[PDB]
């Protein structure tokens, strides 16, 4: 997050950070208290053995324990049609072995129903634990920023990406710069204000630097993969 401010302890209970080898690598979001929605590029072959994974919830500053007080991941389900060259279909699901009962500052986000009729220049918000300005370290405190949704046709311009965005993937950010996520902001909850309820419609997959001109943010689209999550949840139970 570049150009943002520190996130006050309000009500944002849809950000779960995954920790492996006692260090933070990638985050994620939760929709139901039985799964974890996160990116799929961190679930590669060297990142196997999901037993060595923990999840933290309701934790702003990442210092409250040491190799303990977490939720162990039982199984991880990734999208079968995942490509490592073009980075397409970068959505993975992690299942927890704990009931995860609802408590204070614990409230998931509902999936977006088909046919939302979203505005072209819709206002959204981002959050995560990444660098500060450029090639920095993991942020100790939680920060948030405000981004806008740009069109796919304008994102496919020859001077921006030259037609490198799939129809099942969208772009969000500012073309002027100074508002972008750096390396380490994997996943991240991208929600918007509509009908007094937030909708998770974004998922960070990759990116070309941060706070750079003609290089907006990259956030996946879950409107096409919404049925896949329901299918996996039905096949699991």
């Amino acid at each position: 997050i570049v150009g943002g401010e520190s996130a006050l302890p309000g009500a944002w209970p849809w950000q779960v950070s995954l920790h492996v080898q006692n260090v933070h690598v990638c985050g994620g979001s939760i929709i139901t208290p039985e799964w974890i929605v996160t990116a799929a590029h961190c679930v590669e072959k060297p990142l196997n053995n999901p037993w060595h994974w923990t999840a933290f919830a309701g934790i702003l500053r990442q210092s409250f324990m040491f190799y303990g007080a977490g939720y162990q991941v039982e199984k991880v389900i990734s999208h079968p049609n995942y490509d490592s060259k073009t980075k397409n279909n970068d959505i993975a699901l992690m299942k927890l072995q704990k009931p995860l009962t609802f408590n204070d500052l614990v409230k998931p986000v509902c999936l977006p129903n088909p046919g939302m009729m979203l505005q072209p220049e819709q206002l959204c918000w981002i959050s995560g634990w990444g660098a500060t300005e450029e090639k920095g370290k993991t942020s100790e405190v939680l920060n948030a920023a405000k981004v806008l949704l740009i069109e796919t046709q304008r994102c496919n311009s020859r001077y921006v990406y030259d037609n490198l965005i799939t129809p099942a993937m969208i772009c969000a950010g500012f073309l002027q710069g100074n508002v972008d996520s750096c390396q380490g902001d994997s996943g991240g909850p991208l929600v918007t204000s509509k009908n007094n309820i937030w909708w998770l419609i974004g998922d960070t997959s990759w990116g070309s630097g941060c706070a750079k001109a003609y290089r907006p943010g990259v956030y996946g689209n879950v409107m096409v993969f919404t049925d896949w999550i329901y299918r996996q949840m039905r096949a699991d139970g």
Binding site: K85, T86, K87, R158, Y159, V160, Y161, D162, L164, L175, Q176, G177, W206, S208, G209, K212, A213, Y214, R215
Partner: protein, 286 residues
Amino acid sequence: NLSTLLRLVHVDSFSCNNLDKSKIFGSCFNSITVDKFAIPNRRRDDLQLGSSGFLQSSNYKIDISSSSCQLYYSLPLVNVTINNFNPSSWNRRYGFGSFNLSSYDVVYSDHCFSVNSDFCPCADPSVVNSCAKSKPPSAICPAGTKYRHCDLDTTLYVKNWCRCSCLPDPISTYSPNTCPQKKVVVGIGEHCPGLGINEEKCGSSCFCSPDAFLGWSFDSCISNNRCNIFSNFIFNGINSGTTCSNDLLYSNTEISTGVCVNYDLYGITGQGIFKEVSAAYYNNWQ
């Protein structure tokens, strides 16, 4: 003399701002500054007293809090020419030519851009060598000005992908802050420093293409076989200076012979009767 001025010129409309037409007949002023330029037929309505048009923001701005009078007159099309010269300094430095347009056509500006001294629409060719996609032309910029800002960045798998600033054009760019060419508005009695130059068609010495200059148009100014030219009269001060008008003492300029009337001939006052007579004893100073 205002009367002779309006008689010898085909005046179409004479209106002023913050000044009355009666107090300018016999008074004195300190100085008078006059500005004139052609009136395009497309932007003829933009010459009103206060408007956010292209003329009043790119070519010449008319002040409202000053005593300035606007004069609209016409000129015959016989033995008339139009001079289209670019007052820009940095544009002609890189080899700016002429518009090469037909006669009886004027050039008006719609988007003016201001740049600093450290500016060069040219890139260092030693850096553009490691570029494969959207490779901009480069040449040797003269000393004293930095080269074009271009960076090498990889998005997914393209190693040789170079991006520069001012894309696609400085008129409508996605990041005006990164591009040094910024839009400027002319002030009271100020010219436009220069127009936008497309960096994709520039570049031996850095020579931009003549077709890369954008942000201007052209249109005829012929109306009823006559050309329209604007005129602005600005009066500095009132009831002062040494610039007066002869609209009072030269009222009749005709004398009678046979009746008695007063006279103020050359500071001599009195009354008497006149009579024509042939005299040949006067000199050039008597």
